[PDB]
Amino acid sequence: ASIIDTVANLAKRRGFVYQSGEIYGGTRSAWDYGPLGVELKENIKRQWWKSMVTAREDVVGIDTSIILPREVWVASGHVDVFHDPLVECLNCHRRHRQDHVVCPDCGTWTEPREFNMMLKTYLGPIESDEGLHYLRPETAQGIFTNFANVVTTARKKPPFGIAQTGKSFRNEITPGNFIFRTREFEQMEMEFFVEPSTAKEWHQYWIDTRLQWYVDLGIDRDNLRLYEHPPEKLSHYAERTVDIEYKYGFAGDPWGELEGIANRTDFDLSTHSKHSGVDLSYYDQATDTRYVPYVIEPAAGLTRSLMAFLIDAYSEDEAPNAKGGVDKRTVLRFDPRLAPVKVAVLPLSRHADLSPKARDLAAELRQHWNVEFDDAGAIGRRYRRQDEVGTPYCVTVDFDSLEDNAVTVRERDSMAQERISIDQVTDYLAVRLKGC
Amino acid sequence: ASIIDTVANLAKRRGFVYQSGEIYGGTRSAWDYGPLGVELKENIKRQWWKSMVTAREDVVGIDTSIILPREVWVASGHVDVFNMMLKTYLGPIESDEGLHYLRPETAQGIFTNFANVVTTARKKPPFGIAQTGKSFRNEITPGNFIFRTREFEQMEMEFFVEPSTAKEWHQYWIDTRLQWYVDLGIDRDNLRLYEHPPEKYAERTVDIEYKYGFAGDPWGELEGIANRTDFDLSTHSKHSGVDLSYYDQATDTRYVPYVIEPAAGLTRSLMAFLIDAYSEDEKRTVLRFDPRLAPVKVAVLPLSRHADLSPKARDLAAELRQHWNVEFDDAGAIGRRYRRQDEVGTPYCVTVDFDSLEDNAVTVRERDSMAQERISIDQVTDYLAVRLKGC
Ligand SMILES: Nc1ncnc2c1ncn2[C@@H]1O[C@H](COP(=O)(O)O)[C@@H](O)[C@H]1O
Ligand SMILES: Nc1ncnc2c1ncn2[C@@H]1O[C@H](COP(=O)(O)O)[C@@H](O)[C@H]1O
Ligand SMILES: [Mg+2]
Ligand SMILES: [Mg+2]
Ligand SMILES: [Zn+2]
């Protein structure tokens, strides 16, 4: 079995993901995130927002509506150019992407017809062109349209960034491998407005910076690469684009896009100034000059980043068991800051004397972290159940704990154990979990 | 001038919110959150998730798609009795085949995964499933400011319980949820319970109402806490064909759990916290945010822009930005800067003066009292941490 299939089976089995509406028929085009998946996803988001907004004086945040005025997508060009060629089979009449011959539904074509990938909706009582709106295909336009508002309230000046996370929607004709390509996804996008003569320099900076981010949160550098977009595959808003690519493990070419870092020159502020009538240029008072900023844009995928982190973390190693033998052990080697469960509190047995201390310790820890309590089954099996989902530390409460008031901390990867007094455990875990 | 108008002006001016698509004509049915608004929003959401999911053994989280299968909303009864749902068309053919609905609530995503969560999370009633997410309603008319919009964020939790306990649990959550708003700094006097009467998917509903200050009747819904009986799990079993009941092996019994549903509005909660924190004293304008909600936790202020002070101030601001959202301000007189920070609820201001070059200490000013205390720099992070009560 391939690595992607293994990781997907693990995710479904342990509740990182469920198929949306599974009981009514789910597709790989729609996924719900279970109790572990939601925490993993939020953790990745939080680390992104820390790196991009909180830690940087030059970058501020925003959250804009999924449904913007239609004119926006006329000015961005998405109405006119955000379309792909579709060919309908002449035997089963199922439409497919032409660029992407034989039919993959029956095997037996019409002339290509352009199909716009944005999703439509209607606001108001009349299902008419007055109420036609597009579910945004990208979060960038809500940033561009607020560039001046932000310059004003935030008192900012180029170079500076506006960052955002949110849901986007594309009418994807076919579902991707697992969660890679879905019709509803979550993006993390930042638009960095710079004085044009510096754009190129700034560009490389962000390409490097973004790359290091993935490495800093645990992704093997060898599983990452850079790809230069050719002029033909350039977006309608881009002059130069570089993609970070991750080795996901697909059949055939195992490499796939992970984050797109684009030099969008002055396109976006220009077009929105032209269409809205509002001047979105920037006035440098230190020089008495006025220019439309260039835009460097790191746009990552939350769900693609979760898939990348989850695949890179997966590993199988030979770990000794209680019998004195050696088993194959499935471990997700997450960075502590991403792991969905930071600590597991595991009484040695269901004994009535161990549950009080174990439960009080679980509560104390829940004050700070997401915690898991499990007294079911043999302890070693529970250690492995936690290792399977990337839990960084297991805290075992045994009978000696009733006398020395100390517990056994077990580190996930090394499986090494250290006995520490309870009244210090929190502190211990804190230093090793590397939160704020 | 009403308090709502004043707060809305302040929110617009300091970039708490902007009207979505302002340059193309905005409406009160759509609002973006600016640099401060996003942070206050995310802080409210984070405190809700900490209270509900992280802190409780008996509650686990989930996040389900906005667009679910159409049969889901045929089974929940929204297609027949709710039309306020927003439609969209998936796939290459724009017809009733691809017709889907944008969820008007986040609950059905939970109900349909009840059995999945019981299985993977190894949970047994009483336990809850919590979710935050975007919901859409084709609201005909927009509300005051950001109170009623077509697109909003919800914080819903469904607590599944053995039926004979529901009523008790119901009251519990009613009280619990209320305390939450109070523990985060809303005045108890501005909160009240409103019992839905028998005439008004549910059996019994209590709304926590906040005194927003509307013209006329200044009260409004802030959070609804309903007892939905066994309606939802029942209907999804029947329509899907999948048994969503629970089997207790301790008693060898099988039942359809009853559901207690606290459901709060992220945007309504933001509007309530903002209106409540607003205040004027001597004159000064202050948002008395709880530290955990304040969009900016600390502002670093050099006495003057100067080669001796500014580097020390910048270094300190970075150290603090490791943990909290910080604001660095070197413009204008120090008291002007204090006023600017008080206006947006910043709990603490740190000033670097010339004395700081000699005793390596700074001046920490507590927003509400305005009391100042001189703290060594190598301790400021701990000093602030103890007082900010989260990061
Ligand atoms: N259909 C999709 N499903 C999941 N992630 C996506 C999808 N489309 C785009 N992304 C992510 O969004 C990022 C930016 O997209 P773009 O703005 O189109 O370059 C990509 O690098 C992906 O990580
Ligand atoms: N259109 C809306 N705008 C803002 N908040 C809303 C809206 N609809 C519902 N809510 C919030 O969601 C909570 C639960 O709603 P419900 O599921 O309708 O009981 C309410 O108490 C509100 O706080
Ligand atoms: Mg920042
Ligand atoms: Mg929990
Ligand atoms: Zn065919």
Author numbering:
A (entry chain B): 2 to 101, 123 to 130, 134 to 461
B (entry chain A): 2 to 83, 141 to 258, 262 to 343, 353 to 461
Paper quotes:
Glycyl tRNA synthetases (GlyRSs) are prospective drug targets for combating Mycobacterium tuberculosis (Mtb) and cancer in humans. Structures of all three forms – complete, or in some cases partial – have now been determined using X-ray diffraction or cryo-EM. Similar to the TtGlyRS, the two Mycobacterial GlyRS subunits adopt the canonical architecture consisting of an N-terminal catalytic domain and a C-terminal anticodon binding domain connected by a β-hairpin insertion. The catalytic core contains the class-II specific antiparallel β-sheet having the characteristic insertion domain after the first strand of the core β-sheet, and the anticodon recognition domain adopts the HGPT fold also found in HisRS, ProRS, and ThrRS.
Crystal structures are described for complexes of the two enzymes with adenosine monophosphate (AMP) and glycyl-sulfamoyl-adenylate (glycyl-AMS) at resolutions of 1.65/2.90 and 2.25/1.95 Å, respectively, and for MtrGlyRS in its apo state at 2.85 Å. MtrGlyRS was readily produced using standard protocols, and 37.3 mg of protein were purified from 2 l of culture. The two groups of synthetases utilize different insertion domains, with the group containing MtrGlyRS having a zinc binding motif. A few of the modelled MtrGlyRS chains are more complete, however, owing to the presence and stability of the zinc binding site. AMP orders two tRNA recognition loops and a section of the insertion domain, and glycyl-AMS further stabilizes the structure, including the closure of a lid motif. The liganded chains are generally much more ordered than the MtrGlyRS apoenzyme, although major sections of the insertion domain are not visible in the various electron density maps. The complexes with glycyl-AMS are also important for delineating the ordered state of the active sites, which instead show relaxed lid motif conformations or dynamics in complexes with AMP, or a much less well-defined active site structure in the case of the apo MtrGlyRS.
